[PDB]
Amino acid sequence: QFKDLLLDPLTGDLDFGTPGDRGMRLALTNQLSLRQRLYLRFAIWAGDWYFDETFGFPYRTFVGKKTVKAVLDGRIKSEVRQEPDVLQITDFQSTMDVVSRSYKCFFTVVTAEGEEISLAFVGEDEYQYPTPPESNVQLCGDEGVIINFKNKLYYLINFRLPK
Amino acid sequence: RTVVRTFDFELSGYPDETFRVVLDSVTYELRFMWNERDESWFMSLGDIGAQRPTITSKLTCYSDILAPYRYLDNVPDGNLYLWPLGDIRTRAGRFNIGPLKGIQMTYSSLIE
Amino acid sequence: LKDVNHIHPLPDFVRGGFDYVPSDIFSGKENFEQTLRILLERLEFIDQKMVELAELRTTLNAEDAILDEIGRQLGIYRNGLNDPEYRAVIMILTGNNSKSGTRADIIATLKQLFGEDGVTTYKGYNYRLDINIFNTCMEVTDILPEIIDMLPLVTHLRVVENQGY
Amino acid sequence: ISPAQQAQADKRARDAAAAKRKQDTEVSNAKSREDIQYTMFVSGLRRGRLNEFERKNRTDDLAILFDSVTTHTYTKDYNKSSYAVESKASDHVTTQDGKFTFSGTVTDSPYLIDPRNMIDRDTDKENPMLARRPAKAIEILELIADSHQLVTLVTEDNILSNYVITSFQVDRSSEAGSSINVQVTLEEFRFKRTSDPKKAKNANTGTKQTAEDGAVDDSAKQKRQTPYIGKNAETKERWENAAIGTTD
Amino acid sequence: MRAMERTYTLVIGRPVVIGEKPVNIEKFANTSKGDAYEIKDLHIEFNVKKDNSKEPNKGYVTVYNLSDEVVNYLSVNQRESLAVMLHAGYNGDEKLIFSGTVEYVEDDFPEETRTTKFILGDGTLNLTTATTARSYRKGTPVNSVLNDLIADLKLPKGRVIDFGNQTLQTSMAFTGNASQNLANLAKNTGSTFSVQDGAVYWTKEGSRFNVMFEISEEGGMVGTPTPKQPSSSKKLIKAHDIKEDVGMTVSTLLNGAILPESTVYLNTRYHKGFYKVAELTHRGGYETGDWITELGLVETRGELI
Amino acid sequence: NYGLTGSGFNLPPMDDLVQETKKTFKSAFGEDFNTESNSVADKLIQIFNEREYQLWLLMGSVYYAQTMQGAEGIYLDDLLGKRGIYRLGKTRSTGTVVMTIDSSVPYNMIYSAATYTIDTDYELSSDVQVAGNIVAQLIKGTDVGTYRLQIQNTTDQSVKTLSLNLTATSGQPLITFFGQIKDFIVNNTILSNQDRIWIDSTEGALYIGYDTNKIMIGLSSRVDFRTNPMAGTRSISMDVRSIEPGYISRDVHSVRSINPTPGGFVDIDNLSAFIDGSDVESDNEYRIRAATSISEGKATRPAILAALLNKVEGIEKVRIFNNNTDKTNSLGIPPYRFMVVCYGGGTAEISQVLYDTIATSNNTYGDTFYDITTDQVERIWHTKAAARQLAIRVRYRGRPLSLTEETAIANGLATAVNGTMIAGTLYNVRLVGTVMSSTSPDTQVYVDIKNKGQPDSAYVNTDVTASTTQVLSLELEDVIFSQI
Amino acid sequence: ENYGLTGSGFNLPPMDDLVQETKKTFKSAFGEDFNTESNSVADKLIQI
């Protein structure tokens, strides 16, 4: 439920929205929040962000060196579980090509969805305060009491005659 | 009647919280009970170790809780109010009470 | 999406509690159910009357037998008024406490007694004011004393009542 | 010295500090969620204990199976007054916490790789030794002990619950290469919010002071008051200052 | 699944300065920099005794391997009285357990481990320096004398039981420390006076206040209650009769929401009934040691004030 | 213990009731009766008990329904109904908009109210005519020939005409022509307008109702003005309301479109935030309004004085007079009619404010009127003070004052524009003090005052007093200095 | 340009105006069709 500015999954810029409803949006669904929380966590190289030297991933250890596939997978699979709301990891297809020296892995992560605790900070309210009456209706009655009775009588006259 | 803010409250949401607070150099004990059907907090105020609470009332927003009770030697003379930090239409809830949860329960004391 | 007034009869009160029979152990025995139903259904009546004890005490629906109590607290005694208009006077006098007797204001108070189109007001140069009534639903002579009270200190007033235009 | 070393001492401090943020963070979240329940299967399995082994899923009721368990022992203790009693005064005895210990092994050449075991979450089917199974077990073992989980033991005869790990040992001797010997010790735990109001009981919190960094606590710490976001500044403004005033 | 583990917090604030109004240790927590020096995850050993008597409640504390900056901040202010608060509980909340001034502080750092020491006093400065000079004539209502002397002491009034329409029988004069004079008025009128965690408590001996606390195996009791005499000596008796003279002892897991003048209900299998509280002792060893509280109870025979 | 006590209404938990009723059962059948877990009586009693918890909670809720705190929904109205305050229903947003129009759109053309929508939820408040609603004008570049100028006097109702020839299309002749137009306009309306019109000689363009940064800020009020050769681009002001009642808000520069585009349209935009509409009134703001009713004063002389000064885009000065004794009195007034004098408040906008007058107080006297719909429609009256400009001469003995140093003195005499209607007396001593104040300290000084246009013999020292409907005025260029 | 020391004195901009051109220039980079009304997420950020 971690709120934050929404990042476009397709381009990487802020998700200002479609041309018909351009604006700014907050990440509300846990899925969207977790997506960008993993994306930033993996995209920032370790130590390259000032104000926090411990954040990021240490790509320099592996890239450019002769490395064992098994060791890399452990670190990749470990960084994911640093988020407190990750249920499990389903599958992991780690493959390496020696000709091009490229490495490419696949996997998915499962996360549940929570409640909103309070709507005070977001948009709307859930209550239905009453509407003041109109004109002399309060002190003298209402005509609808006649209309509903007339309709009931008419529908009952309709019911008895077979159709 | 000049008044200055001097204390703020927070609630953990437990339905039968009870704790002691100090206001205007005097000490009091407070009890908060959650009502299911009426979804509202019931507050009881009394002296430390008192047999029965001195005041019991229902909490609501923008209502002076102590207004009709500033004539007793054991009741604070300040002002106790609940007002929201977010949208003005939000009413007091269970978990939304606190300095940043949405509702600011506050006590303020007159200047003497 | 939800009503703010939580004072309502509990929906489906009876079937609740029966839901607390552990594992249908007694259900379908027709001997324990009747004993439990007979006791629970008594609370139904009490639960229902808890509302009227609060609903009926409001000034809108208060009956004359207790409406007098509401009026007594405000100093508005029954005198010779009857129930339908005794309610009106209570509203009129109470509403007077936040008024200034302006032309727009006067129309608003008369609005609650004669519907939307039942009243009109002419104005005159030398303090003259006129009130017209088209759809009165109550006898006006007994209401008249209040109709004077919410007017400026120096008003000159005429009152004419008729049915329709 | 030279600036070249200052750019080197920082690296020594930065990388070393990053280690705590990894290990120290994992235990924090592992304690922040009580839903997960760990279990261990020491022997027992094939004598009908499979009835409850199949209940374990891969998300909440995690299960651990060792490649082999050599011995496990269970023991309880009691004590009594060493002085003659006055006479029946049978209350002169106390019960201690029962202890449980066992020895096991994890090998690079497993014979059974049932995926239900949490050790084999993502182990390769055809190359068990590249999966580095012994390293997988240790990573799991430290996290369970560090977070102080109440483990449940399923044994040959009985079932034990509310047991915490107090010590374990790992070694790689010259003999039995490509495997690790593991020892564990556990003891009983005599353990004794969002809650139903019907179950609530009167509680206490003692004396309390100004709560959290509020509009008043900020003044105490000399912090500047938080500006108000102007969603609406027409209604509250006339009333807020007149009735609540300002901290000053 | 977790275990049930201990937690605590210790805070150090600005020097305490007495003025012309009641002293509240709460407002001195913040340091000139703002946030105070908080110490959470360091092995700590403390002992805090409380009572209902003239003397203030004092507590001892020890901390191992403190950072040099914090020790430096205490090397300074050695002429001054820093305000300190202590909290304890179980991993979900921490109740105030002591608040006062640092009377003493010393550091010994032999080889491997430094060990800081503290001695804290609950209102020691006020109780030992508040002078008074008052007098009254025959006929003065005693209820007026009591209020006059307490206001001099400059402390918040936790709870007081006025005397009613009592009047002085002889002229009276009071000087010296206000606390000493009040403690003398206690003897001749059957009233108990004692300051605690900054609150002034004036009650009447023999009588007691509801069941504010219940003790049972569910309430984390530790062992069965045992009868222990409330004083180390016996007085001659005619055999005011209303006075104390009996008591019991109980132990429980640490719980700071208890005070000497409170009332407790004892729900055990042998002993059952209501008792006053007379003494408290809080002990604690974070990494190793007990985390319990000991209560000395006293039987009551007066009216239910 | 938990029912009605001396300190309000309390609430019991479930367990206390359970224990009490179990004790009752124990007493019923001795200490041997079983009541825990396995007893059928236990299953009946526990199930029975939980329901009365609901009854107790509802009863507790009922009690607070008749107290200053705890009232909600319908019950809240009754409590505050005793004090004559009622909730507000659905409301419609209201506001004003302006749009620029092409040079070719004729003056007399009138926009149909029911054939346009500003945006998805806004429509014209009522019918609008181009003439008489010009708020700002821009003239630039392309405009030789003969030109006619028309303007309706803002104090009288006599149309004024001016005749000029544009012999040249640029240069000093064009500058002089623009200056003549400026002098023509400023002599009517209000002097505050001249501060908002100037000529940019570098570009040879004339700006009406703009600021130095070329932002349309508008004149002091809607007016009528025409040129027989319709040059430049004109701007008008419209009144807009929302289609359906509800909640909606718009900012200072939000409105940007019109669905059916009228011919000659140029642009459209806001000038100030709209009075946003609201949904059904909620409890919190209901209590807030109930709390702040103290300042709500009306139908009194101080109240009417305060209201005018805080409800008009102008109204620099205001004063009232009374005549209520059987006769017209010295000042020409009907026997029982009030008199209100204002300055720079417009006609329609100020007229609406006058609905705070005491009912049955005739008022309705003056030289200008307007009609307002209540339903019935009624007419109100008032007047606008006629400004009178003064000419001031300053003589002194001392060092000669340098150019650009007299600016402080000239602006210092701005106090002369602060005189009140009728009761305005210069107190030349005050002027002497001011002229000696807005300068560095330091021999002799005198002040002479006369009406504009009079010969130099009219200079005097005695103080001047405003007429019944006149108010003092002064221009910066009408100050002179002499050394002695 | 009309802000700060100016020889004739010192000029201070009020709270409201600074928002106005900030939104205006901010709007210029994304066109008119860009929500910036009250309580909108973008507006909330600008105010801070």
mmCIF file of N, CA, C and O in Angstrom, chain E residues 79-120:
data_model
loop_
_atom_site.group_PDB
_atom_site.id
_atom_site.type_symbol
_atom_site.label_atom_id
_atom_site.label_comp_id
_atom_site.label_asym_id
_atom_site.label_seq_id
_atom_site.Cartn_x
_atom_site.Cartn_y
_atom_site.Cartn_z
ATOM 1 N N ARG E 79 28.220 19.896 36.834
ATOM 2 C CA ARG E 79 27.744 20.818 37.855
ATOM 3 C C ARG E 79 26.228 20.961 37.840
ATOM 4 O O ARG E 79 25.674 21.615 38.731
ATOM 5 N N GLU E 80 25.550 20.372 36.860
ATOM 6 C CA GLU E 80 24.138 20.617 36.619
ATOM 7 C C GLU E 80 23.341 19.325 36.738
ATOM 8 O O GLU E 80 23.897 18.225 36.786
ATOM 9 N N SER E 81 22.017 19.478 36.782
ATOM 10 C CA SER E 81 21.107 18.353 36.995
ATOM 11 C C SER E 81 20.342 18.052 35.705
ATOM 12 O O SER E 81 19.307 18.643 35.394
ATOM 13 N N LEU E 82 20.880 17.098 34.949
ATOM 14 C CA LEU E 82 20.240 16.682 33.706
ATOM 15 C C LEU E 82 18.979 15.881 33.998
ATOM 16 O O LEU E 82 18.947 15.057 34.915
ATOM 17 N N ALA E 83 17.935 16.128 33.208
ATOM 18 C CA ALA E 83 16.696 15.374 33.345
ATOM 19 C C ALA E 83 16.780 14.064 32.576
ATOM 20 O O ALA E 83 17.289 14.017 31.455
ATOM 21 N N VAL E 84 16.269 12.993 33.183
ATOM 22 C CA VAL E 84 16.339 11.659 32.600
ATOM 23 C C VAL E 84 15.004 10.957 32.783
ATOM 24 O O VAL E 84 14.358 11.066 33.831
ATOM 25 N N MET E 85 14.594 10.223 31.748
ATOM 26 C CA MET E 85 13.398 9.395 31.787
ATOM 27 C C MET E 85 13.768 7.988 31.346
ATOM 28 O O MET E 85 14.671 7.795 30.530
ATOM 29 N N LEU E 86 13.059 7.002 31.890
ATOM 30 C CA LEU E 86 13.310 5.599 31.584
ATOM 31 C C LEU E 86 11.997 4.923 31.226
ATOM 32 O O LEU E 86 10.973 5.169 31.867
ATOM 33 N N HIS E 87 12.034 4.068 30.208
ATOM 34 C CA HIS E 87 10.858 3.349 29.734
ATOM 35 C C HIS E 87 11.187 1.866 29.621
ATOM 36 O O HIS E 87 12.335 1.498 29.361
ATOM 37 N N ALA E 88 10.179 1.023 29.824
ATOM 38 C CA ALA E 88 10.359 -0.414 29.706
ATOM 39 C C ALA E 88 9.021 -1.068 29.398
ATOM 40 O O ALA E 88 7.956 -0.502 29.659
ATOM 41 N N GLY E 89 9.088 -2.275 28.841
ATOM 42 C CA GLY E 89 7.895 -3.008 28.464
ATOM 43 C C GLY E 89 8.215 -4.286 27.718
ATOM 44 O O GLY E 89 9.268 -4.887 27.943
ATOM 45 N N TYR E 90 7.311 -4.722 26.818
ATOM 46 C CA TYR E 90 7.507 -5.960 26.059
ATOM 47 C C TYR E 90 7.165 -5.709 24.587
ATOM 48 O O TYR E 90 6.032 -5.904 24.150
ATOM 49 N N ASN E 91 8.155 -5.222 23.837
ATOM 50 C CA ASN E 91 8.227 -5.282 22.374
ATOM 51 C C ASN E 91 7.042 -4.621 21.675
ATOM 52 O O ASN E 91 6.978 -4.616 20.442
ATOM 53 N N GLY E 92 6.091 -4.058 22.419
ATOM 54 C CA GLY E 92 4.931 -3.442 21.804
ATOM 55 C C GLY E 92 4.555 -2.119 22.429
ATOM 56 O O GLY E 92 3.738 -1.368 21.883
ATOM 57 N N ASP E 93 5.152 -1.815 23.577
ATOM 58 C CA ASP E 93 4.843 -0.598 24.307
ATOM 59 C C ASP E 93 5.815 -0.487 25.469
ATOM 60 O O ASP E 93 6.376 -1.483 25.932
ATOM 61 N N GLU E 94 6.010 0.740 25.936
ATOM 62 C CA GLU E 94 6.919 1.001 27.037
ATOM 63 C C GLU E 94 6.285 2.030 27.958
ATOM 64 O O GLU E 94 5.918 3.122 27.523
ATOM 65 N N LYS E 95 6.165 1.671 29.230
ATOM 66 C CA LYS E 95 5.528 2.512 30.231
ATOM 67 C C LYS E 95 6.590 3.286 31.000
ATOM 68 O O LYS E 95 7.665 2.754 31.292
ATOM 69 N N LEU E 96 6.288 4.542 31.315
ATOM 70 C CA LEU E 96 7.208 5.337 32.114
ATOM 71 C C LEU E 96 7.477 4.630 33.432
ATOM 72 O O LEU E 96 6.546 4.209 34.126
ATOM 73 N N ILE E 97 8.754 4.496 33.778
ATOM 74 C CA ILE E 97 9.152 3.758 34.967
ATOM 75 C C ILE E 97 9.923 4.613 35.963
ATOM 76 O O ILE E 97 9.973 4.252 37.151
ATOM 77 N N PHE E 98 10.528 5.717 35.539
ATOM 78 C CA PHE E 98 11.204 6.615 36.460
ATOM 79 C C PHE E 98 11.469 7.933 35.750
ATOM 80 O O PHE E 98 11.628 7.973 34.526
ATOM 81 N N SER E 99 11.514 9.009 36.532
ATOM 82 C CA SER E 99 11.834 10.328 36.007
ATOM 83 C C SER E 99 12.388 11.175 37.140
ATOM 84 O O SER E 99 11.789 11.270 38.213
ATOM 85 N N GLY E 100 13.536 11.796 36.888
ATOM 86 C CA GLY E 100 14.191 12.573 37.923
ATOM 87 C C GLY E 100 15.432 13.252 37.382
ATOM 88 O O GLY E 100 15.524 13.550 36.191
ATOM 89 N N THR E 101 16.381 13.487 38.281
ATOM 90 C CA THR E 101 17.611 14.193 37.969
ATOM 91 C C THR E 101 18.813 13.310 38.267
ATOM 92 O O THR E 101 18.784 12.485 39.184
ATOM 93 N N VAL E 102 19.875 13.494 37.488
ATOM 94 C CA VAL E 102 21.097 12.717 37.651
ATOM 95 C C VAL E 102 21.875 13.260 38.843
ATOM 96 O O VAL E 102 22.580 14.269 38.732
ATOM 97 N N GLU E 103 21.751 12.592 39.991
ATOM 98 C CA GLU E 103 22.468 13.037 41.182
ATOM 99 C C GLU E 103 23.962 12.770 41.065
ATOM 100 O O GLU E 103 24.781 13.606 41.470
ATOM 101 N N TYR E 104 24.338 11.614 40.525
ATOM 102 C CA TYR E 104 25.729 11.191 40.478
ATOM 103 C C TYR E 104 26.014 10.527 39.142
ATOM 104 O O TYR E 104 25.102 9.995 38.497
ATOM 105 N N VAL E 105 27.277 10.564 38.725
ATOM 106 C CA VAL E 105 27.718 9.936 37.486
ATOM 107 C C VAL E 105 29.219 9.717 37.565
ATOM 108 O O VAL E 105 29.963 10.619 37.964
ATOM 109 N N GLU E 106 29.667 8.522 37.186
ATOM 110 C CA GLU E 106 31.089 8.211 37.173
ATOM 111 C C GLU E 106 31.362 7.177 36.095
ATOM 112 O O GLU E 106 30.482 6.397 35.726
ATOM 113 N N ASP E 107 32.595 7.175 35.595
ATOM 114 C CA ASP E 107 33.009 6.290 34.513
ATOM 115 C C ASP E 107 34.281 5.562 34.922
ATOM 116 O O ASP E 107 35.238 6.189 35.385
ATOM 117 N N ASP E 108 34.280 4.245 34.748
ATOM 118 C CA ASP E 108 35.468 3.414 34.901
ATOM 119 C C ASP E 108 35.641 2.587 33.632
ATOM 120 O O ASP E 108 34.699 1.930 33.179
ATOM 121 N N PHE E 109 36.835 2.642 33.045
ATOM 122 C CA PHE E 109 37.106 1.990 31.763
ATOM 123 C C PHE E 109 38.372 1.151 31.875
ATOM 124 O O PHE E 109 39.398 1.454 31.261
ATOM 125 N N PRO E 110 38.328 0.069 32.651
ATOM 126 C CA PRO E 110 39.495 -0.819 32.747
ATOM 127 C C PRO E 110 39.551 -1.766 31.557
ATOM 128 O O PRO E 110 38.697 -2.641 31.400
ATOM 129 N N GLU E 111 40.569 -1.585 30.720
ATOM 130 C CA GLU E 111 40.826 -2.452 29.573
ATOM 131 C C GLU E 111 39.598 -2.664 28.682
ATOM 132 O O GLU E 111 39.302 -1.814 27.838
ATOM 133 N N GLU E 112 38.879 -3.777 28.842
ATOM 134 C CA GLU E 112 37.990 -4.250 27.786
ATOM 135 C C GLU E 112 36.691 -3.462 27.680
ATOM 136 O O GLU E 112 36.245 -3.193 26.561
ATOM 137 N N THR E 113 36.079 -3.079 28.799
ATOM 138 C CA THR E 113 34.706 -2.577 28.760
ATOM 139 C C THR E 113 34.565 -1.392 29.699
ATOM 140 O O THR E 113 34.947 -1.482 30.870
ATOM 141 N N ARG E 114 34.015 -0.288 29.193
ATOM 142 C CA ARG E 114 33.639 0.830 30.044
ATOM 143 C C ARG E 114 32.285 0.562 30.687
ATOM 144 O O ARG E 114 31.428 -0.109 30.107
ATOM 145 N N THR E 115 32.096 1.099 31.897
ATOM 146 C CA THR E 115 30.868 0.895 32.668
ATOM 147 C C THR E 115 30.474 2.235 33.294
ATOM 148 O O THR E 115 31.094 2.707 34.248
ATOM 149 N N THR E 116 29.430 2.849 32.747
ATOM 150 C CA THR E 116 28.918 4.095 33.299
ATOM 151 C C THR E 116 27.939 3.814 34.430
ATOM 152 O O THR E 116 27.199 2.825 34.401
ATOM 153 N N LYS E 117 27.935 4.687 35.434
ATOM 154 C CA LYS E 117 27.073 4.548 36.598
ATOM 155 C C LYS E 117 26.227 5.803 36.767
ATOM 156 O O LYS E 117 26.655 6.911 36.435
ATOM 157 N N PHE E 118 25.017 5.617 37.290
ATOM 158 C CA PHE E 118 24.111 6.721 37.565
ATOM 159 C C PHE E 118 23.437 6.509 38.913
ATOM 160 O O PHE E 118 23.256 5.379 39.370
ATOM 161 N N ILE E 119 23.076 7.621 39.546
ATOM 162 C CA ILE E 119 22.178 7.630 40.692
ATOM 163 C C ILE E 119 21.164 8.735 40.457
ATOM 164 O O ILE E 119 21.537 9.906 40.319
ATOM 165 N N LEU E 120 19.887 8.370 40.415
ATOM 166 C CA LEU E 120 18.823 9.293 40.047
ATOM 167 C C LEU E 120 17.918 9.537 41.243
ATOM 168 O O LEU E 120 17.655 8.620 42.028
#
